[PDB]
Amino acid sequence: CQDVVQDVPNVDVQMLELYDRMSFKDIDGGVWKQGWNIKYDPLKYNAHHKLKVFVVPHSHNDPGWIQTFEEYYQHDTKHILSNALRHLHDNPEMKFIWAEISYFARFYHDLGENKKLQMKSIVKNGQLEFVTGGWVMPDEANSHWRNVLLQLTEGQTWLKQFMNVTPTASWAIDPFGHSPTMPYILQKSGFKNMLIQRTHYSVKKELAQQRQLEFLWRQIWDNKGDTALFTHMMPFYSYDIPHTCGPDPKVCCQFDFKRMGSFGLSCPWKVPPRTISDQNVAARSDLLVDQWKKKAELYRTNVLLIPLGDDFRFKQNTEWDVQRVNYERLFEHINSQAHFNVQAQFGTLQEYFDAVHQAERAGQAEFPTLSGDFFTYADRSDNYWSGYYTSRPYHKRMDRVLMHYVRAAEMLSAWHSWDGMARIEERLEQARRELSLFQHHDGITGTAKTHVVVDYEQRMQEALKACQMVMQQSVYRLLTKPSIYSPDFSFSYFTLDDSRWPGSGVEDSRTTIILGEDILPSKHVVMHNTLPHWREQLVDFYVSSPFVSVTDLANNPVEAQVSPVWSWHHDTLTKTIHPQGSTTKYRIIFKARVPPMGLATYVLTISDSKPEHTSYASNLLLRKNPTSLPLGQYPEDVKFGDPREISLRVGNGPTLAFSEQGLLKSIQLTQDSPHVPVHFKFLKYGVRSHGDRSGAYLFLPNGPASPVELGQPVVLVTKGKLESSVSVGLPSVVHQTIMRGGAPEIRNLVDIGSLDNTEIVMRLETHIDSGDIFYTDLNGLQFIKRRRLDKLPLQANYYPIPSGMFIEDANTRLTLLTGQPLGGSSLASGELEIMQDRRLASDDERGLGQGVLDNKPVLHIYRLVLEKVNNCVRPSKLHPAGYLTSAAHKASQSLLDPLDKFIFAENEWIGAQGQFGGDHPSAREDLDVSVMRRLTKSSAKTQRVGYVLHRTNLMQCGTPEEHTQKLDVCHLLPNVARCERTTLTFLQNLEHLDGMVAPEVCPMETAAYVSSHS
Ligand SMILES: *[C@H]1O[C@H](CO)[C@@H](O)[C@H](O)[C@H]1NC(C)=O
Ligand SMILES: OC[C@H]1CN[C@@H](O)[C@@H](O)[C@@H]1O
Ligand SMILES: [Zn+2]
């Protein structure tokens, strides 16, 4: 295993280092506005060294954006695909590439057999080529790597099954900025090449000058280079035709033959395309070839890629004809005029890369190595696309909840083979596809129109329901004596209970367990732990009485705590935001201990008075002018007081001190240690009154944020033996700090209401001497070093915070982990900030045609980990990566993959069992079974189960951390006959494993294994 901490990789281009050096000046470079006047030597190409040009026809299809997926399919895409099938069938030399398998599958299943056969034929013969082959072209900023893998697998599995092909070249022309998580996953999924387009215009200029637009992209910690994937970065401002034939859009636009009038399109540079004729072909070719030779100067080989396409192009048969015929006339003339020394033809993306590597193998070019990312993107001037790291935060949070529910549903149902009547495969397929669709670069990004966001939400809601059905059926089967197990595959044996989604104050969705001497004395509940190690976590349930005790299934008492159910209200009468306690229901909380990838059953039993092992939280409402807060049967009366500073300590955990406004002010790790200044503060950014306006994509603040005026907020303190918390009703946010004995959990119920042109940010102020350095993660997979650059505007220093960020000095680190992707930064030494929501009244000129005014209450969650790190073995100053501590990684896991909770839905569960998985190996804490998925239906003689195993890398800070068992996923199910290491999508076997043992993987590595069983 490579050491991913101590050796700084030697690469030709390291993006953080490049950023430190680059000046980013936005100077007018001429017709190539963001470049320079490219010059070339006409003698470079000649009879024995021609410029091979591949014109690659494409059609960018967004699976939802201005219309919903189905609306675009009906109005545009089904015509594009039907006409592509006809045109390619009839014109054997025409080519076309396709990326979005969600649309292709939607089309294909509506085709009759004759057409399906014609389609397989043009794919088999190389005319129609799939690029990437993912369900969508995903966002790369907010997406979790697990969902990027999920959607890639969904599309490639469909392609293998129905088209018998697996793309090895990736095409990503629209994500707003690019992540190295893509080559990481692609290279482990059989890919050999990838192409990207949206990178900062300054970076395109810089790499173009050095002919470094094509590079071997390796991971920031990869010293050896085995993660390397050849990447082609396009050079220009757009993937449209005006910005893909060469440097001058006024000339290239003339070669987009769909812009002549009858299609309602034109060239904004005021020179329209002209039909190619025998009389003008030489002059048109003179112009086109000159553009091509200028573009070729920016690369190292004599093979040139010329994309030919735009949004939803190649729709009408007349469009196919006008593009094809005019280009064929140009090719016939150009390839017969020896003086151009050009051979041009339509080609596919793989054809291009194959020729490039033939040139490379012939010793004609060597490519530079590069590590780093391409965030934050700006397409022009100071227009940085950091707004979408936060836009539509409700759905960004929903993405993470469904991410976890899909994993749990697939894992819980994988243990058994199911009868087709159970509809398990059907429900899981729907769930995987709706989540996969939302990874689209206008889905999770929050950049779609309002009715499209609603469509994604409805689809994810149906996916969550499908997951719940599968999980509850699976739990009943896993924990019921087999000879008693009697399933009704449509029956609800259990109801899932989720404390954080949609969340208290967002939707009243949780069921109350109704107990009573006259109706039901007790209730079984079950917890599932999807992680491959024993895990304890506090869980809560709503109950109809505060006098409830908990036992495990051996009837052993389990210590519990009961707290009231508090809900906050913006009281339009008193004009205060204050809490009301329920008089009909209460929260029971206790520590559940669950086996690795297993289940554990507990029982809640009512009693007539306080039970021996249940304690009751005290509650204190701090506010001027209080009124009573009756709590029905709750045994402790609420206390009141004027606002004041308070301190709390749960267990042996940290002691936290709060200001009289209910916000954290300091953390003291142990009773003897210092009260470290750590202060939460809420601020707001506005929008510019002159010039460019922030919108769904762009963050264009009118200067640094201003503090939210807090008034004298109402603060509620609940103190319990197992859990305490401080909650405060601030304008737009009910802010809560919860303590369970370790790093606190922060929950913000964010309701931006009608505050137009406002972005609400949550900032942490410390005295940590971080200077201009901070760390943020990429897709929940790795942490990358960031350096705040004052030569760049505020919005450029904002980065995606898909799951965590931290600052540190030589001795102290503060890590903030998130349960949802949001945008954030460290704008000054000692600070961290992360945006909660943004409401924008204007459109930002990127095509959406609306601002963001559809905000709704969202419950954001976090873990805040303050740690001493002077004893940790950290990377050197020049290393571009950072790594979490064990506590911060576990904290992240508690937000993203919490225990699942199930309430038995009927009165009596006959045949109930206490635990499942007690014999599963408890793997080392840095290892995770990211995916467990049965790959065969029940009629398959040989069953197959796939596993994706990921090992992160955690800092060695002196904790002995020991004794764990090796996890061999191939032996998790009985009767194993074979164990194979496969690509991450499970589509190709890479290694037959001895003894049918799946070895564990190295730090920062991810492997896939498939076990076969008789
Ligand atoms: C398609 O995949 C390869 C062709 O390169 C080969 O296995 C066979 O011809 C096809 N597979 C099928 C249809 O089973
Ligand atoms: O300007 C951004 C838009 C451009 N390309 C389209 O296909 C959209 O997905 C993008 O959101
Ligand atoms: Zn797009």
Side-chain angles (χ1 to χ4, degrees):
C1 297
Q2 288 199 88
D3 179 323
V4 307
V5 175
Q6 309 185 101
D7 307 316
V8 181
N10 170 30
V11 294
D12 296 306
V13 178
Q14 205 305 305
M15 294 304 294
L16 183 68
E17 190 277 345
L18 185 57
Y19 258 45
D20 201 20
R21 293 194 269 105
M22 275 169 75
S23 83
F24 296 83
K25 301 307 185 163
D26 185 24
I27 95 84
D28 190 334
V31 296
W32 183 1
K33 293 271 151 226
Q34 295 158 317
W36 66 95
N37 291 333
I38 300 171
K39 288 172 184 337
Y40 62 85
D41 174 358
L43 302 176
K44 179 174 183 170
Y45 290 109
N46 57 56
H48 313 290
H49 183 70
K50 299 188 177 177
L51 181 58
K52 289 179 55 176
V53 178
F54 289 105
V55 176
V56 181
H58 69 93
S59 175
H60 184 60
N61 289 241
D62 295 308
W65 177 38
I66 295 318
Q67 292 184 54
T68 62
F69 177 85
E70 188 63 17
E71 283 167 351
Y72 279 132
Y73 175 70
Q74 289 302 325
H75 303 150
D76 298 281
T77 306
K78 71 180 188 178
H79 301 291
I80 293 166
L81 290 176
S82 177
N83 289 331
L85 174 59
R86 285 221 171 283
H87 278 274
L88 295 177
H89 174 259
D90 293 345
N91 295 282
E93 303 303 297
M94 187 56 176
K95 304 275 178 61
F96 187 54
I97 58 173
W98 193 263
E100 305 84 9
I101 303 310
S102 51
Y103 278 123
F104 199 84
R106 170 82 179 80
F107 180 73
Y108 195 83
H109 296 290
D110 272 9
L111 283 187
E113 192 62 38
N114 177 89
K115 285 322 192 315
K116 280 184 188 178
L117 289 174
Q118 284 186 16
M119 180 67 78
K120 292 182 59 156
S121 190
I122 55 169
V123 167
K124 188 170 93 282
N125 76 13
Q127 281 187 268
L128 168 64
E129 179 179 288
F130 293 102
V131 290
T132 305
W135 204 237
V136 299
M137 170 179 299
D139 173 35
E140 296 179 20
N142 299 297
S143 50
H144 198 286
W145 75 269
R146 288 157 55 180
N147 292 338
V148 168
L149 175 59
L150 183 71
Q151 68 75 35
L152 179 64
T153 302
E154 198 62 28
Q156 291 212 333
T157 297
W158 187 91
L159 286 174
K160 186 179 191 186
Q161 174 168 20
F162 295 100
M163 285 298 111
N164 187 31
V165 295
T166 302
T168 61
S170 188
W171 173 260
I173 52 169
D174 211 27
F176 323 140
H178 294 282
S179 177
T181 292
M182 301 307 290
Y184 179 81
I185 293 183
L186 297 174
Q187 189 276 330
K188 286 166 161 53
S189 299
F191 281 72
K192 296 201 143 36
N193 299 102
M194 62 180 291
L195 170 148
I196 61 178
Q197 150 67 18
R198 291 184 182 276
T199 62
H200 196 296
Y201 57 88
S202 292
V203 171
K204 287 163 177 280
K205 184 172 175 182
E206 188 76 9
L207 301 177
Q209 286 176 314
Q210 309 301 322
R211 300 192 309 162
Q212 288 167 337
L213 291 166
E214 281 173 328
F215 45 87
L216 290 167
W217 192 5
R218 68 170 71 178
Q219 301 302 304
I220 58 185
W221 70 78
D222 180 14
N223 270 276
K224 192 171 187 321
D226 294 325
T227 60
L229 188 65
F230 183 83
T231 304
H232 173 100
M233 178 187 297
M234 300 173 44
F236 308 132
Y237 164 81
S238 171
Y239 51 77
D240 67 11
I241 293 163
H243 300 90
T244 46
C245 95
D248 190 353
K250 174 177 187 177
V251 170
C252 297
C253 196
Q254 298 179 53
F255 298 88
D256 183 345
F257 298 92
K258 194 180 188 175
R259 298 180 187 240
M260 286 177 296
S262 65
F263 292 99
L265 296 175
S266 56
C267 285
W269 298 273
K270 307 173 176 163
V271 186
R274 273 159 292 295
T275 298
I276 305 299
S277 63
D278 284 10
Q279 297 68 52
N280 70 17
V281 68
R284 297 275 83 188
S285 295
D286 286 338
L287 272 177
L288 187 52
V289 175
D290 170 74
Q291 285 305 300
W292 290 345
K293 287 190 170 182
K294 286 165 167 167
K295 191 178 184 186
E297 278 305 296
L298 306 189
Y299 298 90
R300 298 184 181 201
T301 74
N302 66 332
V303 179
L304 182 68
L305 177 67
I306 301 295
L308 184 79
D310 203 338
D311 292 8
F312 293 98
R313 284 302 190 88
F314 290 100
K315 183 178 171 184
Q316 295 155 68
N317 297 143
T318 53
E319 174 183 357
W320 278 92
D321 286 329
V322 88
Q323 297 286 33
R324 178 183 57 75
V325 173
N326 285 298
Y327 271 90
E328 286 183 1
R329 291 178 183 139
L330 290 165
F331 294 158
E332 179 183 344
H333 175 82
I334 291 163
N335 303 345
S336 67
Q337 292 309 295
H339 69 87
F340 287 130
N341 295 293
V342 169
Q343 173 57 31
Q345 51 268 302
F346 292 124
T348 62
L349 186 63
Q350 183 64 47
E351 272 186 277
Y352 170 70
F353 285 120
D354 280 352
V356 164
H357 291 300
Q358 282 163 17
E360 182 187 14
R361 281 194 304 279
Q364 169 195 133
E366 311 189 295
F367 300 103
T369 58
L370 181 150
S371 75
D373 69 344
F374 297 100
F375 291 118
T376 286
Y377 169 69
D379 54 343
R380 61 184 166 90
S381 51
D382 66 349
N383 284 193
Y384 285 78
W385 294 43
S386 38
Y388 86 94
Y389 301 161
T390 302
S391 301
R392 277 61 177 265
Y394 182 86
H395 311 83
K396 282 174 157 56
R397 169 56 181 150
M398 189 174 190
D399 174 83
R400 301 299 202 258
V401 173
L402 180 59
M403 176 183 75
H404 170 67
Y405 275 58
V406 164
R407 161 182 177 162
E410 293 201 287
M411 174 174 295
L412 276 164
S413 67
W415 296 106
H416 289 99
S417 205
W418 296 76
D419 185 87
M421 267 188 42
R423 304 170 70 186
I424 298 304
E425 286 87 357
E426 186 202 329
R427 266 62 183 276
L428 293 178
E429 176 159 89
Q430 179 182 13
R432 286 196 298 278
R433 294 170 169 196
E434 308 292 20
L435 178 57
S436 291
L437 179 74
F438 194 57
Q439 301 314 302
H440 169 45
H441 58 270
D442 296 300
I444 190 177
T445 56
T447 56
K449 282 185 112 60
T450 299
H451 81 286
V452 181
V453 172
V454 166
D455 184 54
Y456 290 137
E457 188 177 337
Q458 299 183 288
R459 293 171 169 276
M460 291 200 281
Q461 188 67 250
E462 291 303 311
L464 284 170
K465 290 193 288 176
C467 287
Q468 173 174 228
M469 170 59 65
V470 173
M471 288 180 283
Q472 65 93 8
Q473 287 285 341
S474 299
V475 169
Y476 175 56
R477 186 175 186 179
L478 285 163
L479 294 174
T480 299
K481 187 187 183 187
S483 57
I484 292 176
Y485 176 61
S486 189
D488 174 345
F489 297 131
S490 71
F491 191 74
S492 285
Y493 292 93
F494 295 84
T495 303
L496 267 173
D497 180 63
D498 193 318
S499 301
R500 300 183 301 193
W501 179 267
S504 148
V506 179
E507 298 292 352
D508 178 56
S509 63
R510 293 181 71 184
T511 73
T512 299
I513 296 177
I514 313 272
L515 298 177
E517 296 173 33
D518 294 302
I519 182 176
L520 182 63
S522 72
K523 173 63 70 190
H524 282 53
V525 294
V526 174
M527 266 58 65
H528 171 236
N529 168 30
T530 197
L531 305 182
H533 53 260
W534 278 93
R535 175 158 59 150
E536 292 186 317
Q537 179 210 285
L538 294 194
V539 293
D540 67 321
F541 290 89
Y542 288 168
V543 288
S544 66
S545 171
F547 307 120
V548 176
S549 40
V550 185
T551 47
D552 65 16
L553 217 62
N555 203 40
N556 302 311
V558 173
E559 201 203 337
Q561 170 189 317
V562 167
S563 294
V565 172
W566 294 106
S567 58
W568 291 74
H569 293 106
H570 183 339
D571 188 331
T572 58
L573 280 289
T574 57
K575 303 292 175 173
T576 55
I577 299 164
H578 66 100
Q580 307 270 70
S582 171
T583 54
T584 57
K585 76 191 198 193
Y586 314 85
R587 279 175 70 236
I588 186 155
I589 303 142
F590 61 95
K591 187 162 58 185
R593 179 166 176 275
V594 193
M597 298 166 66
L599 302 164
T601 311
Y602 291 80
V603 178
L604 303 193
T605 302
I606 190 170
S607 63
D608 66 76
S609 58
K610 294 191 291 183
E612 173 174 358
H613 300 279
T614 298
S615 62
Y616 294 86
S618 60
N619 298 270
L620 172 68
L621 198 277
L622 300 176
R623 68 172 297 177
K624 283 281 187 61
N625 190 32
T627 51
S628 66
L629 290 169
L631 297 173
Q633 304 181 74
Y634 195 83
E636 270 273 299
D637 296 312
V638 178
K639 297 311 186 65
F640 303 83
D642 285 349
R644 64 175 200 256
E645 298 205 327
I646 56 139
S647 288
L648 292 172
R649 180 184 203 193
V650 175
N652 298 323
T655 289
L656 301 197
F658 304 79
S659 81
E660 71 172 69
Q661 290 118 76
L663 294 146
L664 189 71
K665 80 176 239 176
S666 71
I667 298 174
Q668 182 193 42
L669 301 183
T670 52
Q671 278 190 310
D672 299 311
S673 69
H675 284 284
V676 179
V678 174
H679 183 49
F680 267 125
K681 184 180 287 177
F682 285 90
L683 304 100
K684 37 176 53 178
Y685 284 97
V687 177
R688 297 165 189 184
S689 54
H690 312 281
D692 302 335
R693 265 76 161 166
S694 298
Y697 306 84
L698 308 188
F699 173 32
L700 288 162
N702 63 334
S706 306
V708 167
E709 277 311 310
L710 304 183
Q712 296 173 77
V714 174
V715 177
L716 170 67
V717 183
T718 296
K719 177 173 174 180
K721 181 179 177 170
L722 300 188
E723 184 181 76
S724 299
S725 65
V726 174
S727 300
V728 56
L730 308 177
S732 304
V733 187
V734 176
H735 175 68
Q736 321 146 48
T737 302
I738 309 169
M739 290 160 278
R740 295 187 191 90
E745 175 186 353
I746 309 306
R747 297 190 188 162
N748 291 334
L749 169 58
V750 185
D751 182 6
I752 201 161
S754 73
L755 293 178
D756 288 5
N757 292 331
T758 297
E759 305 203 27
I760 294 161
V761 64
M762 172 177 67
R763 184 173 295 156
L764 280 154
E765 295 172 335
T766 77
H767 296 170
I768 295 175
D769 186 9
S770 57
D772 55 3
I773 301 302
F774 59 109
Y775 295 75
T776 63
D777 72 306
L778 285 160
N779 316 91
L781 174 62
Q782 56 183 284
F783 281 77
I784 187 167
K785 204 209 264 217
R786 305 302 199 180
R787 166 180 298 107
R788 190 193 75 244
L789 295 173
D790 302 325
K791 70 200 172 186
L792 297 185
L794 195 159
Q795 64 272 16
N797 285 297
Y798 250 58
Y799 288 94
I801 310 302
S803 74
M805 64 193 307
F806 66 82
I807 46 158
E808 63 180 4
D809 54 25
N811 296 309
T812 312
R813 178 184 291 190
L814 186 62
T815 307
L816 181 65
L817 291 320
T818 77
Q820 60 286 319
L822 300 165
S825 184
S826 171
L827 294 175
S829 183
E831 305 182 348
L832 292 170
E833 70 179 59
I834 181 163
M835 198 74 76
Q836 305 301 290
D837 202 354
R838 57 207 303 266
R839 178 172 176 90
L840 309 159
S842 299
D843 171 65
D844 51 0
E845 301 182 36
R846 293 306 183 286
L848 177 56
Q850 63 160 88
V852 175
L853 294 170
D854 54 1
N855 314 75
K856 58 201 285 194
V858 54
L859 180 76
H860 287 328
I861 66 173
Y862 313 82
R863 291 294 296 287
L864 182 69
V865 188
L866 173 79
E867 307 167 292
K868 308 311 304 188
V869 292
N870 55 298
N871 285 316
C872 299
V873 176
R874 286 176 285 181
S876 89
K877 282 182 54 74
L878 310 185
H879 203 289
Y883 296 98
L884 294 190
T885 52
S886 162
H889 174 249
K890 282 190 177 288
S892 177
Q893 294 185 311
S894 75
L895 298 173
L896 293 179
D897 294 281
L899 297 180
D900 306 298
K901 302 181 292 168
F902 301 84
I903 301 168
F904 186 68
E906 291 303 334
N907 286 343
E908 187 169 0
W909 178 3
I910 299 122
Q913 303 179 321
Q915 188 186 72
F916 162 68
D919 59 348
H920 293 167
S922 190
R924 199 165 83 175
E925 71 179 326
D926 54 358
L927 192 67
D928 194 15
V929 171
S930 310
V931 175
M932 182 179 172
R933 174 185 300 130
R934 177 166 300 254
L935 304 169
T936 49
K937 297 195 182 183
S938 65
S939 64
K941 288 185 74 285
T942 297
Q943 290 295 310
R944 305 166 73 233
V945 180
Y947 302 83
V948 171
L949 198 70
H950 176 65
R951 189 188 303 265
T952 188
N953 182 68
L954 302 176
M955 291 210 300
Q956 292 245 63
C957 304
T959 309
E961 296 163 25
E962 331 203 69
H963 77 290
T964 58
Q965 310 154 259
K966 293 296 165 59
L967 175 65
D968 169 11
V969 299
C970 274
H971 281 91
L972 282 172
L973 289 163
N975 305 321
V976 62
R978 182 179 304 94
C979 180
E980 294 272 343
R981 187 166 65 81
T982 67
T983 40
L984 301 185
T985 55
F986 305 126
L987 302 174
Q988 185 195 357
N989 298 323
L990 303 171
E991 178 180 10
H992 188 65
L993 297 154
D994 276 357
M996 306 165 295
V997 173
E1000 303 185 331
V1001 308
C1002 292
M1004 299 304 286
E1005 153 166 61
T1006 304
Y1009 297 102
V1010 171
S1011 56
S1012 295
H1013 307 267
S1014 334

